[PDB]
């Protein structure tokens, strides 16, 4: 077939969020003069993933996710913390990290010439615009669809409906979504009636395609 419209997730799809996060956590903890252990990093990631999942399922706001993750983590290690203040510091550090996924720039640069590209993301709009710009990816996308502007969030069908209504001459059948989240991107997109491409470099709901490297999309899209 011949897709015309490509919906990209941002974090761990085209930008290396793991890298950004690793640095921002270190800088947050340095700032707070709190030792950051490998165990603490592992617990952060379970806590953070659990909060985001709760948000995705509609049990929590995104503000709560971001403003309680650090207070919840530190509580388990004997520190009482202002979650909101720590998130403000963290956010400032995170926005400086604009590390790319291997081959992302080249890929997006080439695909822009033959497809219409859109961003679909639940991340903080200020954060996503800055990193997309600093990485060089920004100019290639026709529109940016952030959860915070919609009243909903990936994977919710109402988020994808908001997106579809706002893409001119939208055709589900000629639309591919590319993303790393099996639940947010792949299951969201499939339920919303779209083909899906699961970005899964670490080889962890059946997608139309599953890839290890962004460069595999050249073959999938026949170009
Ligand atoms: Cl997202
Ligand atoms: Cl975040
Ligand atoms: Mg992602």
Curated annotation (Swiss-Prot):
Top-rank taxon: Bacteria
GO biological process: pyrimidine ribonucleotide catabolic process
Enzyme class: hydrolase
NCBIfam families: HAD-SF-IA-v1, YjjG_YfnB
Molecular function (Gene Ontology), one example: 5'-nucleotidase activity
Highest classification ranks of the organism: Bacteria, Bacillati, Bacillota, Bacilli, Bacillales
Pfam assignment, any one: Hydrolase
Record family assignment: Belongs to the HAD-like hydrolase superfamily. YjjG family.
Keyword annotations of the record: Hydrolase
Active site: 9 (nucleophile)
Protein's recorded name: Putative HAD-hydrolase YfnB
PANTHER family per record: PTHR47478, PYRIMIDINE 5'-NUCLEOTIDASE YJJG (PTHR47478:SF1)
EC id: 3.-.-.-
Record's keyword annotation contains Cell membrane: no
């Amino acid at each position: 077939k011949r897709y015309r419209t490509l919906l990209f997730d941002v974090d761990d799809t085209i930008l290396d969020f793991q890298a950004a996060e690793a640095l921002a956590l270190r800088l947050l903890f340095e700032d707070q003069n709190i030792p950051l252990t490998n165990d603490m990093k592992a617990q952060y990631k379970t806590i953070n993933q659990g909060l985001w999942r709760a948000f995705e399922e509609g049990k929590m706001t995104r503000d709560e996710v971001v403003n309680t993750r650090f207070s919840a983590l530190l509580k388990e290690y004997g520190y009482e913390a202002d979650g909101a203040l720590l998130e403000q510091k963290y956010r400032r550090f995170l926005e400086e990290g604009h590390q790319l996924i291997d081959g992302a720039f080249d890929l997006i640069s080439n695909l822009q010439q033959q497809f219409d590209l859109y961003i679909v993301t639940n991340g903080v709009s200020h954060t996503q615009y800055k990193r997309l710009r600093d990485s060089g990816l920004f100019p290639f996308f026709k529109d940016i669809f952030v959860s915070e502007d919609t009243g909903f969030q990936k994977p919710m069908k109402e988020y994808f409906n908001y997106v579809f209504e706002r893409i001119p001459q939208f055709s589900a059948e000629h639309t591919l979504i590319i993303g790393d989240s099996l639940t947010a991107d792949i299951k969201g997109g499939q339920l919303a009636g779209l083909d899906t491409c699961w970005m899964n470099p670490d080889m962890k709901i059946i997608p139309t395609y599953e890839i290890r490297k962004l460069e595999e999309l050249y073959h999938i899209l026949n170009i």
